[PDB]
């Protein structure tokens, strides 16, 4: 036999924290866990890396506030996880469309009706023109600000739940920190828990399909070698994003919400330097946010800097990085010599850099239904998904864990009845 | 994205060495050149890697005959990489049948002028009992001697240019080295001589689509980040093997050939330990074919140790990896425990270890003496397939260098005119 009492298709925080519920209660003594992950290491979309061997940097996932994230700080805590604190929330070198609009988004706040959940830029051009809100909204440097199927409410929300930006609005006293380590000890000190209880893992395994066969389920895997695997199991979770669930044969969305979903992608690039010459400038810890392409660029200590963009702006760098290493760097030069007021020549070359692009970075749902739950259920199959994207914190890994206490929670319901 | 005069898919040894005829020929002076293959690093099934910092293991292509493989020889020596003798070409420990095995080919053979191109197994099989067929073939590891469309006549040629069983044919004038330092080393020396004359590479994107163009054509490619990319080029060869050509749009195999492929799986495992414990046996550079799963079992010095199998042997120990790490080692341990004739607990559990599968380890010609061109062409679109497949050396990098030569002429020729 290749069975399994329970299943769960996803080794991200998500699935990894179901698993951790899941051998928690006792009335899953003898039965059997399987956890499936395409990938070859668990994690998903937390991905911590050592760059030139020398300090540690998030692909991913990088930061957490206490204020927005409880569950999050508990399980750091659980797992002895050590934090720092995260430097760059605050704009040393600001600007006067920065500085205009914090005072200009207390005005607008009457959006109930006025202004209601248009798009963020329709919205703005009411206050003042239509130029000068692309300026304001420009200045907070996450691109997704611009599109259409973000609305003005949504906008508020996502501004002030960002550390860069957040002293805009009214949540300026939240806090903010980074993994020591990197959130991947996290990660590991849950797959570990969860070994040691006894699941077991198939990493490098991609679901293809699944069909009810009885009183239980059939899973059709691919191996990233191209053994194809058959696994039979009583009781699944899928948790996955939802631009992987409308990869299956589930009918997702439609038997499984309301709602719709969207996602954007992320771009990161990381560089260190033979020598940390931004510490002349007084830049060490300080995050500058510039119209140029690299968008929001950071200052970590005397160790690297990196930028980080988002939608057009995270395509646009992923395609210059397919043009070849050479353009892209020369670029990011350009760009770093522009932010700071100085002549290319000052900027020297890197040592070391790496980049991540996610296609799918954020994922979300435009909350078309009334409610909408942390876990979903397909309404015939009784699958059972989980995702950040289900829940108030879509985009956060808080939302995961919280994703995760929902969906074992419906499973347990599965066992009981 | 951008284009190309010249694009060549595949970055395995076939499509490095017709990339490097290319740019030595004047005909390509100023032409541009593009590079696609889906893996990060070139080689394909040329991969080395040094288990564990202290030892250099082939997990694809481990050694060549300079007698059988001139071409290769020639390139070892063109791009200065060190051989060595490699050991395993007698065995020592041989049974009761592994002596029989000789005189009962060097008999059967007059037999195969007549009744000669039919199934090896029911060849064998037509002059001694089926009962003593199955257990002579057994008695040679290589379980593609079992299969229907695997000749006498074919079983023949395989039998004599495989070292551990070249003795069975009277073929022991073939000498056998490995590379010293890995095949790697010769893949990053074209590698390196190729993007020293201006070769583009982009790895990491796999070809899903071409379709012709005007006079050139259109390749949709998926980087493996999601990152989907488009391309233009004017003459197209694409270096990978005939599985991979199946997954194209391109009418293959009719449109290029009137031969038929097969491919057979072929898995690898890598075990090191604490004490080199196989030597109180007389074991190092010694080789043992044995009728358990195992079925051929070599320990390199005092190194490591590993076993190779083929097609369903190869299938059995893919699904017993697929089942768990922890039942496939102890699997191991049981069948080499009853290969030395041991008990169980006199063999140690395995400090490291690594395996590899090959789904379609070797491709093949299957209408087998068409006087098979060694490289094809698109009889509409002029697109040059590249394999070791298409030539006389099928399953060899031998095959893959004739293949490049041809390849390159053609596109030489279709350059010029
Ligand atoms: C660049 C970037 C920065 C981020 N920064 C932050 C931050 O600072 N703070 C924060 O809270 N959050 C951040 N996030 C988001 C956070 O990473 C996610 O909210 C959280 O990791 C999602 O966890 P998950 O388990 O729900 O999904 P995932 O992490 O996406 O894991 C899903 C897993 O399912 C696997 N999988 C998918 N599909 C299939 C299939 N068909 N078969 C098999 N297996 C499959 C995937 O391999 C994946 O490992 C960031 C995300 C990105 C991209
Ligand atoms: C286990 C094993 C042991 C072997 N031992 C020996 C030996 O000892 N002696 C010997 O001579 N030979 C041996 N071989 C054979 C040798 O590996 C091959 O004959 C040779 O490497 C084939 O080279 P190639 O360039 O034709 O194809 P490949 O090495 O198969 O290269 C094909 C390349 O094209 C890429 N590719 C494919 N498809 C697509 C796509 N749609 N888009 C983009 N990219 C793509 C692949 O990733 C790959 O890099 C062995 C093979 C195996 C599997
Ligand atoms: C651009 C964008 C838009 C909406 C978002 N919701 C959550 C995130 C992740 C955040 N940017 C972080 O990295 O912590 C995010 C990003
Ligand atoms: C089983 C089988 C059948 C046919 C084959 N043609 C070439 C090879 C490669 C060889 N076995 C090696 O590993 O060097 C091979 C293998
Ligand atoms: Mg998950
Ligand atoms: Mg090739």
Chains 1, 2 share one sequence.
Not at 9 to 19: D, N, Q
Not at 353 to 369: I, L, N, P, T
């Amino acid at each position: 036999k290749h069975s399994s009492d329970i299943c769960i298709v996803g080794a991200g925080i998500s699935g990894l924290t179901c698993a951790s519920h899941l051998l928690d209660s006792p009335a899953c003594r003898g039965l059997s866990l399987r956890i499936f992950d395409m990938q070859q290491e668990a994690g998903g979309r937390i991905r911590s890396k050592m760059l030139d061997g020398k300090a540690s940097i998030e692909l991913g996932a990088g930061r957490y506030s206490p204020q927005l994230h409880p569950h999050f700080q508990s399980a750091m805590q659980h797992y002895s996880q050590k934090s720092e604190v995260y430097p760059f929330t605050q704009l040393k070198f600001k600007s006067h469309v920065q500085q205009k609009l914090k005072r200009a988004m207390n005005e607008l706040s009457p959006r109930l009706k006025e202004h209601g959940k248009e798009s963020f830029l329709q919205f703005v051009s009411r206050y003042q023109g239509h130029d000068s809100a692309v300026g304001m909204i420009r200045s907070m440097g996450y691109d997704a600000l611009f599109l259409p199927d973000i609305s003005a409410e949504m906008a508020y929300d996502i501004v002030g739940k960002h550390p860069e930006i957040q002293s805009v609005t009214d949540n300026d006293a939240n806090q903010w920190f980074a993994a020591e380590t990197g959130f991947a000890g996290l990660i590991q000190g849950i797959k570990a828990k969860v070994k040691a209880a006894g699941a077991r893992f198939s990493l490098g395994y991609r679901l293809l399909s699944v069909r009810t066969d009885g009183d239980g389920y059939l899973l059709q895997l691919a191996g990233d070698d191209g053994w194809k695997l058959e696994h039979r199991t009583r009781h699944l979770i899928l948790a996955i994003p939802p631009s992987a669930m409308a990869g299956l044969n589930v009918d997702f969305p439609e038997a499984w919400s309301g709602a719709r979903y969207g996602s954007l992608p992320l771009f990161k690039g990381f560089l260190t330097y033979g020598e940390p010459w931004w510490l002349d400038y007084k830049l060490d810890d300080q995050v500058l946010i510039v119209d140029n392409p690299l968008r929001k660029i950071y200052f970590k200590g005397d160790k690297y800097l990196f930028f980080y963009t988002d939608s057009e702006m995270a395509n646009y760098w992923r395609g210059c990085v397919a043009e070849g290493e050479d353009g892209y760097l020369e670029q990011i030069r350009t760009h770093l010599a522009s932010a700071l007021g100085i002549v290319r020549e000052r900027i020297p070359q890197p040592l070391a850099h790496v980049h991540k692009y996610w296609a799918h970075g954020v994922e979300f749902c435009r909350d078309s239904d009334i409610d909408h739950p942390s876990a979903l259920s397909h309404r015939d199959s009784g699958i059972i998904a989980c995702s950040d994207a289900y829940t108030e914190h879509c985009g956060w890994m808080e939302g995961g864990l919280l994703s995760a206490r929902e969906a074992s929670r419906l499973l347990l319901q599965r066992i009981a009845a």
